[PDB]
Write a protein that binds this ligand. Sequence first.
Ligand code: ZN
Ligand code: ZN
Length: 66
Amino acid sequence: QTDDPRNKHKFRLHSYSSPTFCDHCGSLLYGLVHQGMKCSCCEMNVHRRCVRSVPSLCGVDHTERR
Ligand SMILES: [Zn+2]
Ligand SMILES: [Zn+2]
């Protein structure tokens, strides 16, 4: 099983105490999702239905222009 292109965000529902804001829709993650989904790779909070909208932009930041 060599094929393993998992370069997406490792979103992981956390359990701090309240839902954080979403960066893909800029909206507080209502109870619809236990808190917010924090990416365990670049730190990105999103909704449970907003990930299917993001083109998996994890580990693909970029390089400064220096
Ligand atoms: Zn990420
Ligand atoms: Zn969202």
